[PDB]
Design a protein around this motif. Structure first.
Motif, mmCIF file in Angstrom:
data_model
loop_
_atom_site.group_PDB
_atom_site.id
_atom_site.type_symbol
_atom_site.label_atom_id
_atom_site.label_comp_id
_atom_site.label_asym_id
_atom_site.label_seq_id
_atom_site.Cartn_x
_atom_site.Cartn_y
_atom_site.Cartn_z
ATOM 1 N N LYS A 268 83.187 79.258 36.159
ATOM 2 C CA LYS A 268 82.359 78.366 35.542
ATOM 3 C C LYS A 268 81.319 78.726 34.781
ATOM 4 N N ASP A 269 80.907 78.644 34.173
ATOM 5 C CA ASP A 269 79.904 78.975 32.924
ATOM 6 C C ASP A 269 78.520 78.999 33.213
ATOM 7 N N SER B 123 86.671 73.984 31.618
ATOM 8 C CA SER B 123 86.816 72.835 30.276
ATOM 9 C C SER B 123 85.047 73.276 30.410
ATOM 10 N N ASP B 124 84.502 74.560 31.323
ATOM 11 C CA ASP B 124 83.530 74.682 31.304
ATOM 12 C C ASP B 124 83.609 76.689 31.308
ATOM 13 N N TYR C 128 82.606 71.293 27.979
ATOM 14 C CA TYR C 128 82.191 72.279 28.030
ATOM 15 C C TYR C 128 80.368 72.283 27.783
#
Lengths: 692, 90, 218, 174
Positions: free
Chosen positions: A262-263, C108-109, C152
């Motif tokens: 994840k970012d 979603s990210d 995001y």
């Protein structure tokens, strides 16, 4: 058929272009032209005496198949490279530093004389640098000549030059738009007078000037350097015009390639902050932090200027994910130990959440083991880590039942430096211990006064302890490191209320230094030290003793097979059985001491059969290993004939070759070496193999 | 528990005393932008207001903000100018 | 391997193997006859079958290659809406790992570059061909993609709130407002904007965003 | 089934509807880019697994304008109707209720299409009345209600399939 040195698909494209696409009428008239065109195609590679023949095979439904028979006879060869006109350097000293060769040693095969049109310009650049770096400023090429003998086997190369003269630098007159940085830039441009002019020195100077300007945010400046040559005094002045551009701002930084992590995980390790004045070095610090994190095959940066403004710039990090930790499930069935069970995982970056979670366990008839561990590395924003684990085991075969719990909190200080501290509980119990001088004397040091006549022994302990640790790593890649240092110390100390009382300190260090500019040949130095000692009165328990040999400490020996060997007592109740011995006998097994020291120096060399494209998955080394381990709770006058096990003198040595491969099942490690030195009973497994 | 290291944090447009000295009413958006560079934020709701905020948060030793606000007319002509050397109170 | 047979029976076995459900030899024979006869009248139908085959077997990069080839050769084929829809579908379904959906963690990210391109493709379809067979499904999927992108964006803004870089969060929520002023993510993220303005004491706009939040509280 | 439906994922159907953000008094909302903008279209589309993801059947005079199957320039066009009768008597072995020859109008009966894919037998009747449009003696098929599984379903996709069965065969032999 017959195209030894080229690929079929390019020939297919060539015939595609010539209107000889598959699925067209076979023009028998054009056959000679097709052949001649392919001859011109080999004209490029360097095969000039080649002949191509066409075979026409009819097929049902009135079709045709074509056989293209290629005959690549002999290609061009460089006869000799002939530089002409020079009264400072011999020709060989100059030819030695090109890429193309005119001759190779008879005892060595590493290259050929295959002339390429591209390599000429690179070689001329190299030669120009070679003269001009030692103050031959006026030097220039008169011309170059490539000649073919009317044999299509010999190639002659001549370079007409002019050695100009020997000039030397005088002074620097850097100026322009410095944006109020004249002091540091003038310190960097400074050089004492009388030193000779150098070519690449000025280029490096300019590049570092650009970098220093960028560090304050002038991303795109213009820097030029112009020489002015006085022939009378053999001198040269230099003008360095710099024009700092506008200060650039990062609109936003994006991430590509992370399809599973994840970012947040990527963004946590960023020193350059989105929405702030650009730091030309902070972006690079972030990039190397991403590399050091340890689960990215490749990371690269790209600072794209947005068309809508002369200032806003978007920094894009592109990464290539790699596997990290993997599942296993083994149920081994047999006659001994029956259907033994085993399973577990061991992975950091859990589902991309960034955690580190490892569960493992095995079920055996006489040995049940289980361990569970979790660790969040960025519990807070700053980067404190919260981790814990549980473990349970019982081993009956020797009887040992134990379980332990521990929790650790870590935090960073300065850069590259982290400190851990934590608590631990461990409950342990031993039963039916075999006769052994060291364990018996330790138990007496505890105060049980057991009976050597028979192995009816029970012992139980509950211990509470404190843990501390210090880590410092600056190593460029988190896996297959190629440069830097990595030091990790950790110690455990007992606390009041604990049956045992001791303190143990372990330390590990890996240091990589690169030699070739391309980071392909590396020198690795590995050190590991360890000392455990009773806090007072009591002595450090035998069951936490160190070891050596094995796969991770010193390659060549079996697992944990280095150190003092145990001593049994032969009597009625051992099975050292009464009808098998009479006098005390040493036992070939190995029980480790309380102090160990090992090291290993090795050379990292690429392996063949893998293209550089996939080189990043294999790594071969030639290694030289040294190791030793001893005990301090030992006496020799008590045992004259029994050899001493407290002498730091039996330093075992080994040497050999080792290989690592990050296969799509894990880090597979193979090694073959010989123990050039050995002592006592040091049974050696010559070839070692393991995962992780 | 402020022993943990914290990376330096910056969030500004790097206002420099000379640059704020050049400010004088009667420039247009392009002129003031060339003076200072593109603002990193403006009011998106109803009006065209340019904010040049210059923040610095080093270590655990507080924060440093130089605030500047500019309001123009509907024809992009400088009308009102405001500046705060420090942050109100803490 | 495969003999040079008339296009008749090779296509017949193509159809009946595809109807069977076996796909390995199906794509094999399709590519064989596609290479052999790149002039027959089958070509349109051959490639339309092959795109479906690549999609079903999850050979998505090759499906994208073939679909680009098809779009290139006849940009105005009478039934191109289907192939555009398949383009969008492959592009969206390429953004799934089939393991993080097992454990229920929402992607979603993660990298939202395939979601954007799928959105562009679906939008192009609905623009050009609003009267075809793939309208309602396209609209539903496109709503889903818009919400995922909003999620995001909110994720990044939320992290920059935790770090404490308020200019960045201001810009991110402003971009939310300009690009997705219709989703739930922006409605949830407005408080982050008001917090940001209150942080640098630029509160004069903090009350404005406070009205923005309060007006649509219900 | 894995033959005529989208991939197994179906969680997008329950997508929360978009609630447009109201503008409070005294100020307005910023400008929209429109790059991510959703238009409004007509409904009545198969969604979820209901949508038939199967490549369309291109006819192979090959009229493909829906029910329009009027294939027409050969001067022997009359004999094509008995040539089509060869397809009826043999080939499909199908028959026609009122098969006029001078009027060239054949009322072929409802067939039973079953070619794998768990396809229920399809009963399709066509109006095999042969015109003379823009060419020599043309032939036409004009479909009607088609039974299949349900009483009668006439989806746009299936209509292309039902016409194709005759379009493939009739062009296949004649």
């Amino acid at each position: 058929s017959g195209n030894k040195s080229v690929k079929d698909d390019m020939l297919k494209q060539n015939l595609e272009a010539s209107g000889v696409r598959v699925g067209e009428s076979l023009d028998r008239t054009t056959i000679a032209d097709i052949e001649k065109g392919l001859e011109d195609f080999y004209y490029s590679v360097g095969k000039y005496s080649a002949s191509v023949k066409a075979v026409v095979t009819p097929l049902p439904r009135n079709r045709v198949d074509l056989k293209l028979v290629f005959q690549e006879g002999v290609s061009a060869e460089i006869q000799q490279i002939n530089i002409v006109g020079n009264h400072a350097f011999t020709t060989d000293e100059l030819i030695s530093h090109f890429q193309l060769r005119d001759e190779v040693p008879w005892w060595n095969v590493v290259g050929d004389r295959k002339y390429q049109k591209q390599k000429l310009a690179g070689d001329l650049e190299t030669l120009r640098s070679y003269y001009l770096d030692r103050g031959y400023a006026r030097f220039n090429i008169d011309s170059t000549q490539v000649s073919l003998t009317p044999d299509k086997k010999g190639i002659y190369v001549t370079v007409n030059i002019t050695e100009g003269d020997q000039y030397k630098l005088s002074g620097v007159e850097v100026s322009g738009n410095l944006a109020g940085h004249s002091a540091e830039i003038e310190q960097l441009t400074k050089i004492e007078p009388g030193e000779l002019y150098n070519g690449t020195k000025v280029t490096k100077m300019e590049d570092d000037i650009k970098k220093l300007l960028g560090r304050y945010g002038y991303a795109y400046p213009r820097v030029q350097s112009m020489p002015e040559i006085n022939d009378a005094d053999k001198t040269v002045k230099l003008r360095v015009n710099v024009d700092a551009g506008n200060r650039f701002y990062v609109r936003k930084i994006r991430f590509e390639g992370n399809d599973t992590s994840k970012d947040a995980v990527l963004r946590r390790e960023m020193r350059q902050m989105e929405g702030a004045w650009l730091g030309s070095d902070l972006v690079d610090q972030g990039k190397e932090r991403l590399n050091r994190l340890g689960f990215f095959e490749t990371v690269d940066t790209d600072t794209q200027r947005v068309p809508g403004s002369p200032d806003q710039v978007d920094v894009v990090y592109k990464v290539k994910e790699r596997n990290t930790g993997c599942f296993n499930f083994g149920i081994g069935y047999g006659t001994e130990s029956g259907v033994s069970f085993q399973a577990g995982v061991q992975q950091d970056n859990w589902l991309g959440t960034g955690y580190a979670v490892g569960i493992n366990g095995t079920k055996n008839d006489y040995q049940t083991y289980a361990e569970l561990s979790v660790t969040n590395p960025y519990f807070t924003v700053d980067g404190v880590s919260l981790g814990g684990r549980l473990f349970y085991n019982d081993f009956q075969a020797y009887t040992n039942k134990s379980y332990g719990t521990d929790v650790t909190l870590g935090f960073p200080i300065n850069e590259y430096n982290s400190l851990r501290a934590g608590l631990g509980y461990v409950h342990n119990s031993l039963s039916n211990m075999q006769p052994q001088v060291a364990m018996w004397r330790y138990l007496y040091s505890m105060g049980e006064h057991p009976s050597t006549s028979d192995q009816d022994n029970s012992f139980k302990t509950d211990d509470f302890t404190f843990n501390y640790g210090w880590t410092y790593n600056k190593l460029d890649r988190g896996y297959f490191p190629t440069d830097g240092s990595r030091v990790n110390l950790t110690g455990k100390v007992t606390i009041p209320g604990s049956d045992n009382e001791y303190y143990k300190v372990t330390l590990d260090t890996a240091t990589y230094v690169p030699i070739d500019d391309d980071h392909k040949w590396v020198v690795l130095g590995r050190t590991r030290w360890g000392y455990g000692d009773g806090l007072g009165g009591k002595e450090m328990p035998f069951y936490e003793n160190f070891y050596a040999g094995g796969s991770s400490t010193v390659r060549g020996f079996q697992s944990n097979t280095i150190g003092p060997k145990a001593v049994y007592f032969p009597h009625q109740a051992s099975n050292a059985t009464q009808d098998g011995a009479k006098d005390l006998c040493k036992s070939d097994d190995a029980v480790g001491g309380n102090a160990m020291a090992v090291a290993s120096l090795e050379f990292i060399t690429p392996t063949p059969f893998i293209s550089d494209k996939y080189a990043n998955s294999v790594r071969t080394s030639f290694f030289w290993d040294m190791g030793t381990v001893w005990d301090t709770n030992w006496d020799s006058s008590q045992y004259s004939g029994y050899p001493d096990y407290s002498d730091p003198s039996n330093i075992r040595m080994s040497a050999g070759i080792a290989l690592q491969w990050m296969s799509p099942l894990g880090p597979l490690v193979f090694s073959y070496a010989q123990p050039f030195k050995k002592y006592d009973g040091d049974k050696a497994e010559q070839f070692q193999f393991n995962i992780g | 528990e402020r022993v943990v290291y914290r990376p330096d944090i910056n969030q500004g447009n790097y206002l420099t005393a000379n640059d704020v000295s050049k400010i004088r009413v009667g420039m247009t958006q392009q002129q003031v932008a060339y003076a200072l560079g593109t603002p990193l934020m403006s009011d998106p709701f109803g009006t065209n207001t340019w904010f040049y905020v210059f923040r610095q948060q080093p270590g655990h030793e507080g924060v440093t903000q130089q605030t500047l606000t500019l309001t123009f007319n509907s024809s992009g002509v400088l009308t009102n100018i405001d500046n705060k050397p420090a942050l109100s109170g803490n | 391997e495969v003999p040079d047979n008339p296009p008749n029976e090779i296509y017949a076995t193509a159809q009946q193997k595809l109807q069977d459900g076996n796909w390995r030899q199906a794509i094999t024979q399709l590519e064989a006859l596609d290479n052999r006869y790149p002039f027959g009248p089958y070509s349109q139908q051959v490639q339309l079958d092959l795109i479906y085959a690549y999609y079903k077997n999850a050979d998505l990069p090759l499906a994208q290659a073939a679909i680009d080839r098809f779009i290139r050769l006849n940009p105005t084929h009478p039934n191109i809406d289907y192939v555009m829809y398949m383009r969008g579908l492959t592009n969206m379904a390429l953004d799934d790992s089939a393991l993080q959906g097992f454990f229920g963690v929402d992607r979603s990210d993660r990298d939202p570059q395939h979601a954007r391109a799928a959105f562009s493709d679906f939008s192009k379809l609905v623009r050009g061909y609003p009267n075809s067979q793939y309208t309602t499904d396209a609209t539903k999927r496109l709503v889903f993609l818009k919400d995922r992108l909003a999620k995001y964006e909110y994720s990044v803004a939320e992290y920059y709130t935790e770090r404490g870089a308020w200019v960045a969060v201001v810009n991110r929520v402003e971009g939310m407002l300009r690009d997705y002023p219709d989703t739930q993510a922006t409605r949830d993220a407005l408080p982050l904007m008001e917090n940001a303005y209150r942080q640098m004491q630029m509160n004069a706009q903090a009350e404005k965003v406070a009205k923005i939040i309060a007006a649509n509280s219900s | 089934r894995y033959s005529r439906q989208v991939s197994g994922d179906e969680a997008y159907l329950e997508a929360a509807p978009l609630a447009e953000l109201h503008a409070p008094a005294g100020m307005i909302l910023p400008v929209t880019s429109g790059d991510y903008a959703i238009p409004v279209t007509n409904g009545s589309g198969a969604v979820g697994k209901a949508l038939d993801i199967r490549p369309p059947a291109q006819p192979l005079r090959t009229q493909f304008t829906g029910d329009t199957a009027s294939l027409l320039e050969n001067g022997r066009g009359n004999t094509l109707w008995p040539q089509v009768v060869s397809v009826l008597q043999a080939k499909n072995y199908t028959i026609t209720q009122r098969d006029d020859a001078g009027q060239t109008l054949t009322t072929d009966w409802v067939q039973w299409n079953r070619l794998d894919e768990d396809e229920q037998y399809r009963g399709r009747y066509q109006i095999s009345v042969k015109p003379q449009g823009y060419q020599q003696a043309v032939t036409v098929k004009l479909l009607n209600l088609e039974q299949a599984g349900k009483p009668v379903a006439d989806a746009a996709s299936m209509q292309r399939y039902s016409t194709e069965m005759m379009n493939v065969i009739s062009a296949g032999l004649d």
